Design a protein around this ligand. Structure first.
Ligand SMILES: COc1ccc2c(c1)/C(=C/c1cnc[nH]1)C(=O)N2
Lengths: 261, 292
């Protein structure tokens, strides 16, 4: 019952439909006059640090990022206000997903008093208005945990490494805004499985998802390059986080040099 | 913003704030207005976000949200009465069997739709089930609900109004799932038939002992793993399981069979809402208007 046998295919279908509706605009950053891909990377890396400091769920982080990308798809923001958007997004995601969210004062503290309490609460309301309260969005993690049920047998390193790779994709809007969560999750699962065990995307997931290594190839080639370059990336908080024994130290594993795909 | 609504009277109150009956002056529609620091409450954020996609004939509809600087109004569909008040008003007449069966059939359709959309309700009790004069019954109050993942992760402990709370929650299990809302509906089926709560405890331990006195103290045969659960104690008294026909004497054989599957100890064996819709108890189900 913890794997909901009678509902898991209905839920998967439903998430498939909702990811298309919650999808940010692929080309938004070129329409932002004052912010760039690089400034977004810095913000998302900081949110990883905040989630680590307050011991928040990984789902909470993924939700906050969906909210930010949706908000910036329609609202032009100056570089001095980008962190105010991020803070309000993380506050909303914590209220939705956490048993014990941090208090608003804690969210003011982590911005170093760049912003007042009143500014954070005002931005909360604006983000709710712009998104029309539509907060129950699908994430990469929601698809990953379903895919993990197809392992024969379950491997903790495969699970943590796929999580790590999905997380790295959050940092880089080019190229990852062009792929759906269910696709990033599938490429991440295949790459982690291959790296740890030598195995490949299983037939049982072809039956569930309709995705094959053929349709996954473009995202897989991107993700592979990202994994190879991760030690040199300007942003490092995800690699540091996934050194921890909580995540079986998976950021210390060596990427495969080729995929044969 | 609210210029088009005329308040009529107060109809409810809770943790959230207060509910009024009101009437749209332009369309004539009757509505329920739920009126609502740390910014917007997390219970309101969950209610609004989760009801945006839960459009179903047996789930109360969220029609609009009016979010000012100062107040937040949720504009909901209005229904005449709650099932708790109807059960009181049916005192010595009883509620006819065709109406009980229709209401249970409808509650199971609403619940299966929630579960198919990854939502746990977590507070099903007669006060949160609303009825109208045409024979509909609908699930209401999603402020205690929560969107789940597959498989589930640990969520808020000690949930569900005590009298309707499942044993896996009382025993402190790390995980709970869709089976908790089924337990609640089993308690509600018994209550419609008798008119009194099935397990009316006054503390968590008294709640457990009342359930054990009716269904037997569970062991490793009936419920594998039970003796390792965090709040299980080997000193619990060991009560014998009672012939199910003594639990709700007026219920026939099919009714008894469905109730026993909704109140199974082991959450892995408890019946799903989806599976229950095909139970032989519902072979002759219709949808009559309520008798009062
Ligand atoms: C508590 O949340 C809700 C939500 C929607 C609602 C009611 C209550 C509600 C309450 C009620 C009580 N008796 C008649 N109606 C109603 O008609 N619609």
């Amino acid at each position: 019952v913890n794997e909901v046998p009678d509902y898991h295919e209905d839920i998967h279908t439903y998430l498939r439909e909702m990811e298309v509706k919650c999808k940010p605009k692929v080309g938004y950053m070129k329409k932002q006059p004052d912010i760039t891909n690089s400034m977004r990377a810095i913000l998302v890396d900081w949110l990883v640090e905040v989630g680590e400091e307050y011991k928040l769920q990984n789902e909470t982080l993924h939700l906050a990022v969906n909210y930010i990308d949706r908000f910036l798809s329609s609202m032009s923001v100056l570089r001095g206000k980008l962190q105010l958007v991020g803070t309000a997004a993380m506050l909303l995601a914590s209220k939705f997903e956490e048993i014990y969210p941090p208090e608003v004062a804690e969210f003011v503290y982590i911005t170093d008093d760049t912003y007042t309490k009143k500014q954070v609460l005002r931005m909360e309301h604006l983000v709710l208005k712009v998104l029309a309260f539509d907060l129950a969005a699908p994430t990469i993690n929601q698809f990953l945990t379903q895919y993990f049920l197809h392992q024969q047998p379950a491997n903790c390193k495969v699970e943590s490494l796929a999580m790590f790779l999905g997380e790295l994709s959050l940092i880089d809007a080019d190229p990852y805004l062009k792929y759906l969560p269910s696709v990033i999750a599938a490429a991440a699962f295949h790459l982690a499985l291959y790296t740890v065990t030598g195995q490949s995307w299983p037939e049982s997931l072809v039956q569930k998802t309709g995705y094959t290594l053929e349709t996954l190839k473009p995202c897989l080639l991107d993700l592979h390059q990202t994994y190879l370059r991760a030690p040199q990336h300007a942003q490092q908080s995800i690699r540091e986080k996934y050194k921890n024994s909580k995540y079986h130290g998976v950021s210390l594993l060596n990427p495969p040099e080729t995929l044969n795909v | 913003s609210m210029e088009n609504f005329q308040k009529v009277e107060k109809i409810g109150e809770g943790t959230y704030g207060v509910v009024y009956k009101a009437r749209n002056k332009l369309t004539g529609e009757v509505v329920a207005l739920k009126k609502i620091t740390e910014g917007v409450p997390s219970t309101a954020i969950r209610e609004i976000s989760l009801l945006k996609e839960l459009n179903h004939p047996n789930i109360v509809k969220l029609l609009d949200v009016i979010h000012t600087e100062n107040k937040l109004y949720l504009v909901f569909e209005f229904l005449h009465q709650d099932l708790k008040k109807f059960m009181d008003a049916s005192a010595l007449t009883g509620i006819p069997l065709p109406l009980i069966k229709s209401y249970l059939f409808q509650l199971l359709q609403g619940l299966a739709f929630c579960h198919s959309h990854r939502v746990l309700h977590r507070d099903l009790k007669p006060q949160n089930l609303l009825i109208n004069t045409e024979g509909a019954i609908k699930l209401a109050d999603f402020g205690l609900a929560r969107a789940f993942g597959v498989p589930v992760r640990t969520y808020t402990h000690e949930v569900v109004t005590l009298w309707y709370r499942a044993p896996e929650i009382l025993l402190g299990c790390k995980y709970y799932s869709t089976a908790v809302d089924i337990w609640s509906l089993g308690c509600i089926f018994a209550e419609m038939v008798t008119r009194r709560a099935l397990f009316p405890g006054d503390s968590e331990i008294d709640q457990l002992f009342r359930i054990f006195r009716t269904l037997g103290t569970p062991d490793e045969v009936v419920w594998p793993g039970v003796t390792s659960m965090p709040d299980y104690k080997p000193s619990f008294p060991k009560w014998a399981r009672q012939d199910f026909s003594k639990v709700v004497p007026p219920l026939d054989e099919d009714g008894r069979s469905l109730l026993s599957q909704m109140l199974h100890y082991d959450p892995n064996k408890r019946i799903s809402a989806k599976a229950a819709l095909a139970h032989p108890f519902f072979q002759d189900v219709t949808k009559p208007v309520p008798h009062l």
